């Protein structure tokens, strides 16, 4: 019997974008022989990690480091009296101090010491989640949210040394907001806010700790009880000029305090407030404080929940005495930012927990302390200042922004073939389509006469050292010639009466045009004139099959018998022909040779029978043979510059594309790399780009596939444009890099520019003063009938309000005849929304208000007046909030809190057609989905999925299966009839399947007999009904099929029958914290056997390195060396529940980056294929499976 056992291949296509941690240190010295500068930053999101530099005033990707496979719960850089390397704490409790190093040709992250603490999980006892380092780098401190605090004393030597941990344990005191005070080397002092866990009243009390380097323990110093309203602590550096006595800034909600260590000085300064105070107004708070000091002037920046950015300076109050004062003022503010840094340069990096991280340079620096108007003082602690925010943005100037989606709420999958993902932007509220396809610009296109075929571009020999370049087009009957100059595109002898098989430049200032019947040898004469010095014709006449060429070299193949070899004479311009017969023994199909060099060995010949031969250019010999499928449609030979590999790119008829490693000396055919793209005979062309210079081959089909090879990797890709008939690299004085001249399949010339390429790190491009939209997006919708038309729905933060913005095709739509591209709905807020078509010709929209009211709308497309017109129809009161609804046949299928109502279409309001009462277990329905209108899968907050079946004439959904365990399901879909996808609030990605015992029953029986009537259940099921009525109430159970843990929270699953024409249908998910990843079902077995073995290798690979490094120490690198963190793979990915059949490819991908020594060291554990074939199978997934 065939084992179902779905084998899913997880990939992270785009890596988690919500940046939770940062560090200011200078890690690597790159591109400079000797340089030391403190300006650089490394930022971490849980697993994912990135390293940015500025140094230009504009932020720069340095390298995206390998996936750590853990949850980084804090990261802080340490600077010791040297290269500054960051201390990193995560799950496993391990304190892992890592240095970013340059190894081989890339930057890899090396670990120095990892210290075991607590256990492996995210815990309250776990001394993580609160971490800071002595600003002089003498000691690192970790703490726990509740139980205990540990502080290591860090020392540097020939090898780094971490001192034994210093423990303090307070059982009932829940710790929050660790903030360490800088010191002069006196003694390290850290400050916390301890809230008592077990108490009758809520008591939040600050506590000071001075670690004593002399006595080597942490000492409780001052315990100050403050109001329960407390928020956070910041460290005031010295106050050495005013009057060891550290001073802290305690942010409360509606006011700020600062407190002395000795309690002598407690200063209350009330935080100012906005003028509008829109709708709901909290007492607010300050989320993030930071400190800066220069030229005796130290100011701190503290930002409120509204994003208001404030400063504090200290004044002596010379009149009274020398004593500290506290002065608030107002700045440019910003959006809410989790953490703030400042370079030694005037650049202030704002890391926003909301969406985007952006960097500043401050000039105005803010208002002077002299003004009493807008500045508040500690003179009178009771006072209030109202201020209107300033969008003019005087103080701070945005230099660089980083496009990221931290809160991606929903998305729809648009343009299934190029995997394009349509999702909102949270703050800016712009439409973001992030795409797998290559980003392709289009500029100054021009309409060509109909029925065009191929294209070429050759430098104009007539004008030497000039921008003029000749562009050649082809029609079957006619040939068109065109002249290129900057901004000047003009039209022009040669042969216009016959199709052009080939044309190329020879040597210097010469051209040859090969056409079906005869050749032409053309040379430039004067400016607009050219002259053929010789012409070639078959002896008895013949139709030339194909032609290829090199720089100085040429080949043409006629109908059948012989092939013709040409060269150009050196020191002059001439053509010669050899006397010889290369009979080729068959009819030559197409010819290929390297045109990159003046002399190209190893011609590539194709045969109509479907075989490919090599020709040694002693002289000619056939060293290899390929029998491949259908006849070759087109083929190109290209040797890359970097590695010098000569690759033969062989396109085939019916749309199969192929690629071959070609040995230079032997000419053997090895390393077959195939693909299937579209249905059409493919076309190929060669282009050269950068992103270091680079070369790719464009492939023309139903789609357009750029095949490019990055370093030791290559990825075929679809391009953003729908189709391209013929493509060749182009250059213009108008700035052109990656620039290309091509033609659409419509027979229209166009110029374009490719920009971003889907590398392993990116795999996407994101198509989108300070800009913040008041409307925060809600959901995203798409019409069933229109294949892709995407409707967006947002909300207002304030008085309840909504907007609806519909887009189809390129950009949005107008609303009616109005200028506005969106619609505003007053007093309507959307808890959940879905669009429905009750009749095939009518389209309605569905809103569920927080007022518990069901609102119906009508969508209109104006069509060449084209605009969206929304129309309010009905009003219906609802009992529940309606968290989930969807399209059932002809009807709205909605879920109340308890029960599932199926509404029909009534007039003046919509009607309840049927109601289904849930089993007692289900409290609420988060999300639900249908299978072909027959079946449903209904999710819960607390409990798990339960599948229903619609019974006609019973007018009810009957639950036929329960779920095994309790799982909190955010989003849920169907792969099939019998299986279900689901995610968790906590990050589990699982897939369940109904048991075959149930599938036989439902396949062999009608649903009407389930609720009442005769259905014969095996003896065990009933005994489970009377024995365990609570679990088996639904009389079946989901056997766990696939389970996985992705640390994000999955927002949207989508099951795509094909990803960029790939055969294996994938399921792609976007997470909330932002991510998109896929689960690819693996066909056959040895796919998942080889993948499983590679994952098993990379799993303990760090341990294998540790045991080798151990044995060599027995005959004469820590344990977490290769993983950089203590977490095992199976442990991290297992976590909540063990992964079942899912093998994680995100691990096996890390095998690609390791050096050849390490890789060959790992693969020796297998009797199976060599490292090269390993990398083959690894890279096979992105190419072939999507």
């Amino acid at each position: 019997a065939k084992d179902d056992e779905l084998y899913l291949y997880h990939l992270t296509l785009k890596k988690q974008t919500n940046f939770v941690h940062s560090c200011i240190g200078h890690f690597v010295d790159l591109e400079a022989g000797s340089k030391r500068e403190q300006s650089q930053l490394c930022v971490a999101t849980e697993t994912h990690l990135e390293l940015y530099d500025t140094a230009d005033g504009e932020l720069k990707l340095i390298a995206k480091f390998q996936n750590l496979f853990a949850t980084i719960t804090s990261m802080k850089s340490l600077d010791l009296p040297w290269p500054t390397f960051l201390a990193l704490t995560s799950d496993s409790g391990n304190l892992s101090i890592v240095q970013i190093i340059m190894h081989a040709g890339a930057l890899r992250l090396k670990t120095l010491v990892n210290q075991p603490l607590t256990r492996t999980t995210l815990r309250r006892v776990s001394p993580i989640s609160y971490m800071e380092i002595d600003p002089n780098g003498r000691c690192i401190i970790l703490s726990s949210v509740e139980q205990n605090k540990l502080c290591f004393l860090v020392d540097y030597a020939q090898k780094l040394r971490i001192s034994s941990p210093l423990e303090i344990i307070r059982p009932h005191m829940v710790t929050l907001d660790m903030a360490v005070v800088d010191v002069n080397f006196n003694n390290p002092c850290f400050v916390t806010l301890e809230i008592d866990n077990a108490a009758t009243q809520l008591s939040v009390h600050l506590i000071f700790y001075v670690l004593e380097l002399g006595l080597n323990h942490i000492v409780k110093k001052a315990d100050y009880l403050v109001n329960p309203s407390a928020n956070f602590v910041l460290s005031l550096p010295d106050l050495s000029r005013y009057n060891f006595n550290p001073f802290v800034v305690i942010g409360f909600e509606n006011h700020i305090l600062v407190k002395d260590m000795n309690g002598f000085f407690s200063l209350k300064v009330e935080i100012p407030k906005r003028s509008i105070t829109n709708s709901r107004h909290k007492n607010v708070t300050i989320i993030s404080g930071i400190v800066q000091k220069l030229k005796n002037d130290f100011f701190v920046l503290l930002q409120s929940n509204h994003g208001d950015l404030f400063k504090l300076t200290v004044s002596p109050d010379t009149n009274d005495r020398n004593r500290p004062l506290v002065q608030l003022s107002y700045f440019d503010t910003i959006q809410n930012s989790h953490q703030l840094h400042i370079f030694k340069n005037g650049y202030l990096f704002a890391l926003s927990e909301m969406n985007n991280n952006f960097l500043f340079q401050f000039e105005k620096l803010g208002v002077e302390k002299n003004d009493f108007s807008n500045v508040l003082t500690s003179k009178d602690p009771n006072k209030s200042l109202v201020f209107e925010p300033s969008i003019k943005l005087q103080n701070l100037s945005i230099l660089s922004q980083q496009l990221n989606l931290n809160p991606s709420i929903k998305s729809q999958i648009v343009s299934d073939s190029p995997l394009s993902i349509a999702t909102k932007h949270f703050t800016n509220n712009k439409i973001i389509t992030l795409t797998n396809a290559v980003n392709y610009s289009n500029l100054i296109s021009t309409s060509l006469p109909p029925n065009a075929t191929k294209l070429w571009l050759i430098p104009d020999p007539a004008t030497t050292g000039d921008n003029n370049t000749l562009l050649f087009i082809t029609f079957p009957k006619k040939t068109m010639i065109l002249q290129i100059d900057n901004e000047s595109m003009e039209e022009l002898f040669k042969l216009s009466q016959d199709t052009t098989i080939h044309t190329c430049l020879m040597g210097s200032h010469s051209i040859i045009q090969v056409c079906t019947a005869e050749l032409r040898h053309i040379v430039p004469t004067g400016k607009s004139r050219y002259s053929n010095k010789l012409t070639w014709v078959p002896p008895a006449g013949i139709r030339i099959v194909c032609a290829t060429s090199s720089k100085t070299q040429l080949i043409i193949s006629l109908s059948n018998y012989e092939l013709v070899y040409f060269k150009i004479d050196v020191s002059s311009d001439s053509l010669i022909e050899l006397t010889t017969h290369p009979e080729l023994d068959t009819m030559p199909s197409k010819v290929a040779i390297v045109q990159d060099t003046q002399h190209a060995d190893l011609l590539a010949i194709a045969d109509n029978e479907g075989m490919i031969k090599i020709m040694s250019l002693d002289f000619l010999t056939v060293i290899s043979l390929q029998l491949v499928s259908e006849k070759i449609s087109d083929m190109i030979m290209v040797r890359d510059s970097s590695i010098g590999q000569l690759n033969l790119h062989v396109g085939l008829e019916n749309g199969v594309y192929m690629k071959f490693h070609i040995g230079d000396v032997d000419g053997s055919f090895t390393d077959i790399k195939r693909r299937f793209l579209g249905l059409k005979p493919v076309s190929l062309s060669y282009l050269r780009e950068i992103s270091k210079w680079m070369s790719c081959v464009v492939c023309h089909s139903s789609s357009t596939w750029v095949s490019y090879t990055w370093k030791n990797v290559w990825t075929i890709r679809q391009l953003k444009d729908q189709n391209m008939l013929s493509c060749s690299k182009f250059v213009n004085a108008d700035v052109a890099i990656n620039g290309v001249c091509s033609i659409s399949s419509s027979g229209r010339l166009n110029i374009g520019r490719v920009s971003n390429f889907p590398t392993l790190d990116n795999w996407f491009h994101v198509h989108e003063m300070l800009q913040i939209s008041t409307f925060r997006p809600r959901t995203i919708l798409s019409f069933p009938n229109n294949p892709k038309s995407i409707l967006f729905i947002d909300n207002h933060s304030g008085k309840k309000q909504c907007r609806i913005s519909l887009q189809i095709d390129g950009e949005c739509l107008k609303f009616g005849s109005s200028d506005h591209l969106y619609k505003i709905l007053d007093d309507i807020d959307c808890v959940s929304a879905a669009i429905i078509d009750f009749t095939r010709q009518a389209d309605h929209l569905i809103i569920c208000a927080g007022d518990k009211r069901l609102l119906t709308y009508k969508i209109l497309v104006n069509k060449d007046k084209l605009s969206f017109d929304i129309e309010l129809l009905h009003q219906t009161e609802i009992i529940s909030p309606i968290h989930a609804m969807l399209k059932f046949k002809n009807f709205l299928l909605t879920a109340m809190g308890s029960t599932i109502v199926l509404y029909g279409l009534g007039k003046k309001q919509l009607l309840r057609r049927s109601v289904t009462q849930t089993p007692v277990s289900i409290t609420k329905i988060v999300s639900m989905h249908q299978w072909n209108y027959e079946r449903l899968a209904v999710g819960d907050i607390h409990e798990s999925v339960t599948l229903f079946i619609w019974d006609p004439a019973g007018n009810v959904f009957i639950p036929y299966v329960d779920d095994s365990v309790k799982r909190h399901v955010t989003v849920l879909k169907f792969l099939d009839e019998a299986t279900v996808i689901g995610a968790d609030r906590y990050g589990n990605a699982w897939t369940l399947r109904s048991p075959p015992e149930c599938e036989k029953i439902m396949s062999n029986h009608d649903p009407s007999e389930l609720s009442n009537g005769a259905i014969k259940y095996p003896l065990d099921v009933i005994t489970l009904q009377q024995k365990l009525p609570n679990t088996y109430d639904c009389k079946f159970k989901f056997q766990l099929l696939n389970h996985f843990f992705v640390n994000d929270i999955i927002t949207d699953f989508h099951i795509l029958d094909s990803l960029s024409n790939s055969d294996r249908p994938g399921c792609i998910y976007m997470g909330l914290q932002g991510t998109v990843g896929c689960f690819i079902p693996l066909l056959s077995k040895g796919n998942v056997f080889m993948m499983g073995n590679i994952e098993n290798i990379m799993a303990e690979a760090d341990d294998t390195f540790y045991l080798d490094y151990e044995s060599r120490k027995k005959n004469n690198i820590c344990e977490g060396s290769c993983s950089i963190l203590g977490r095992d793979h199976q442990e991290y990915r297992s976590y909540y529940a063990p992964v079942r059949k899912v093998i994680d490819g995100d691990l096996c991908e890390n095998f690609l980056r390791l050096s050849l020594n390490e890789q060959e060291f790992l693969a020796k554990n297998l009797k199976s294929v060599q490292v090269e074939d390993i990398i083959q199978t690894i890279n096979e997934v992105r190419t072939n499976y999507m």
Binding site: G906, K907, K908, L911, R912, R913, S914
Partner: peptide, 27 residues
């Protein structure tokens, strides 16, 4: 130990299934 069958005056969106069947027998 609430279904709505939509009468023709468009006020029957509150009207029960069996009630509208009774008005089928009446109609």
């Amino acid at each position: 130990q609430e279904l709505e069958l939509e009468e023709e005056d468009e006020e029957g969106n509150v009207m029960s299934k069996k009630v509208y069947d009774e008005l089928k027998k009446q109609g």
